Design a protein around this ligand. Structure first.
Ligand SMILES: Cc1cc2nc3c(=O)[nH]c(=O)nc-3n(C[C@H](O)[C@H](O)[C@H](O)COP(=O)(O)OP(=O)(O)OC[C@H]3O[C@@H](n4cnc5c(N)ncnc54)[C@H](O)[C@@H]3O)c2cc1C
Ligand SMILES: NC(=O)c1ccc[n+]([C@@H]2O[C@H](COP(=O)([O-])OP(=O)(O)OC[C@H]3O[C@@H](n4cnc5c(N)ncnc54)[C@H](OP(=O)(O)O)[C@@H]3O)[C@@H](O)[C@H]2O)c1
Length: 514
């Protein structure tokens, strides 16, 4: 285990996509920098989520780093949507190429951080009892890094998709339960159904899912892409989603029934999340949302042969696309299998895990294996700022920030891909955040300044601006973003503009002192 240094210019927490780029870029900027990572190796979510079928919902040609010309040319993606093992290979490749592991302490969890106003430095403590002093603290701890009764009593094998075993798990001949039908559950379930004698899928709220239509990547298409890759990326940087996506100019309410079917069916066959932008008002007008939503509901009823099973898979009562759109591969087809059973926990809630399996209010399920398809990381850290106020106390109602990058009362602390989550392609959003944050840190050293803190009045103005954009959309209607709405919905390109304008005006909204 590489022992962390006692002093460093910048301490980064997390060695996923965000933390590795922060370490790389601060090294290029001539700053001392070190990373603390709970995991045993690099990768972030792509290190932890090793379950079968784990796969990204953003095209491989967009979900990648762009800071390195050599990486853009040397690496060859293989499919439309890269699987977790391929993405992990990619990350390890980048870490190898730039010698990043020499600046990372693995198997180590940051537990406390306190700002010393007398020295303008953070004092950072770990679960190993390490004590690191850093002028700046960068939280690259992700936003995606259960309380059932009797969980400890289960006699079979318990697995979590978010911390899957590193050796593959053979479910052949087993009775298996999967709890959770979000992205993890929808991805892992069809893989288990191929091996298991019986598969029970425990579903609470049914989610919207559209086909991925994953396919191998045409290598002559890629070859042509690599010679214009820098241009292709700047186009992505100038979109609201941080990726190439057609912006449908028509309202969903102005076309006929046959045309809506025709346009939406063309998206359905092509696959991917681009259907979110089939019509300009899908996420802004509730009637337009329900019209597209009802098209998807009927595709579900059409794929599942059992009408009673099909209806319980149909999502009802909340808008399409407000929570992040899941791509499915043979998930709805899975319920036509004889060894697959949909368990509706809304009608019969889970009362307790038992030694034998799962008991709902109606039935006991005998299982050999149980799969739990599961401000988080920040709240487990005792971060204390000015006046020793706790970040968790201040962020109780939701995360109050300026630009999603910093919060007043907590100087020299920056969050990467935390609040504001601007683009749906997180790799474009991450690179923009890391570049902005590390440029600011470089600016502070250039000018001899040592303390950077968001102005409270500007933080409030930013919070009220985020809430105001949201009310033009249907996003506020699902409480998964809730008091303080924690998502800038104005689109990546406009968010990038705001950040660039602040930096060009001497970091307006921050107080810079020495
Ligand atoms: C299965 C899955 C699929 C996804 N697919 C997509 C997709 O298709 N598109 C998309 O845009 N996003 C997707 N994401 C979201 C994902 O968060 C981002 O794409 C991106 O990978 C986040 O990178 P990150 O480096 O910021 O955070 P993460 O990859 O979450 O890395 C954070 C790291 O910080 C470490 N850490 C946290 N707290 C501490 C602490 N206290 N001390 C030490 N170390 C700590 C964690 O162990 C973790 O390794 C997906 C996430 C998951 C889990
Ligand atoms: N690109 C990808 O393909 C991919 C893969 C994995 C994760 N992600 C990202 O990471 C985030 C999380 O996704 P996730 O699927 O793993 O989790 P999730 O979307 O939050 O859903 C978890 C599931 O478990 C259920 N559940 C939770 N607690 C329960 C309980 N006590 N009893 C019964 N059921 C319960 C939930 O039902 P309820 O809805 O009723 O709570 C839900 O079906 C997403 O934003 C996603 O974008 C992406």
């Amino acid at each position: 285990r590489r022992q962390p240094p006692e002093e460093v210019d910048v301490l980064v927490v997390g060695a996923g996509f965000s933390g590795l780029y922060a370490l790389y870029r601060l090294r290029e900027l001539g700053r001392s920098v070190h990373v603390i990572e709970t995991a045993g190796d690099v990768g972030g979510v792509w290190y932890w989520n090793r379950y079968p079928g784990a796969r990204c919902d953003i095209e491989s040609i967009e979900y990648c780093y762009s800071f390195s010309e050599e990486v853009l040319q040397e690496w060859n993606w293989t499919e439309r949507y890269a699987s977790q093992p391929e993405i992990l290979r990619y990350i390890n490749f980048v870490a190898d190429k730039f010698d990043l592991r020499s600046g990372i302490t693995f198997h180590t969890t940051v537990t406390a951080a306190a700002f010393d106003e007398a020295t303008n430095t953070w004092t950072v403590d770990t679960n190993h009892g390490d004590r690191i002093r850093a002028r700046y603290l960068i939280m690259a701890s992700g936003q995606l890094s259960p309380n059932f009764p009797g969980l400890k009593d289960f006699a079979g094998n318990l697995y979590h998709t978010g911390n899957w075993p590193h050796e593959p798990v053979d479910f052949s001949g087993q009775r298996v339960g999967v709890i959770g039908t979000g992205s993890s559950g929808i991805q892992v379930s069809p893989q288990i159904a191929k091996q298991a004698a019986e598969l029970f899928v425990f579903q609470r709220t049914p989610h919207f899912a559209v086909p991925a239509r994953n396919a191998p990547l045409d290598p002559e298409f890629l070859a042509d892409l690599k010679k214009r890759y820098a241009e292709f990326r700047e186009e992505s940087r100038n979109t609201p989603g941080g990726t190439h996506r057609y912006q449908g100019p028509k309202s969903a309410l102005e076309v006929s029934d046959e045309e809506l079917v025709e346009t939406l069916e063309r998206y359905w066959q092509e696959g991917g999340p681009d259907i979110l932008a089939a019509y300009r008002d899908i996420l802004r007008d509730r009637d337009a949302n329900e019209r597209v939503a009802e098209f998807i509901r009927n595709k579900i009823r059409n794929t599942v042969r059992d009408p009673e099973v099909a209806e319980r898979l149909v999502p009802k009562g909340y808008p399409f696309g407000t929570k992040r759109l899941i791509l499915e591969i043979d998930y709805y087809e899975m319920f036509n299998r004889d060894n697959v059973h949909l368990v509706d926990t809304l009608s019969a809630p889970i009362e307790t895990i038992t030694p034998r399996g799962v008991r709902t209010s109606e039935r006991e399920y005998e299982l050999d294996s149980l799969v739990l398809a599961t401000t988080g990381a920040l709240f487990k850290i005792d971060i204390r700022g000015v006046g020793n106020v706790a970040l968790k106390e201040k962020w109780a109602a939701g995360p109050r920030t300026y630009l999603g990058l910093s919060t007043a009362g907590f100087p020299n602390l920056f969050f990467i891909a935390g609040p504001g989550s601007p683009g749906i392609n997180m790799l474009v959003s991450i690179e923009q955040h890391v570049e902005w944050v590390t440029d600011h840190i470089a600016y502070m050293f250039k000018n001899g300044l040592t303390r950077s803190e968001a102005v409270l009045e500007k933080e409030d103005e930013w919070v009220e601006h985020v809430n105001e954009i949201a009310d033009e959309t249907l996003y506020p209607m699902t409480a998964s973003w809730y008091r303080v709405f924690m998502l800038y919905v104005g689109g990546f390109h406009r968010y990038r503009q705001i950040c660039d304008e602040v930096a060009a005006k001497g970091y307006e909204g921050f107080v810079l002192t020495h």
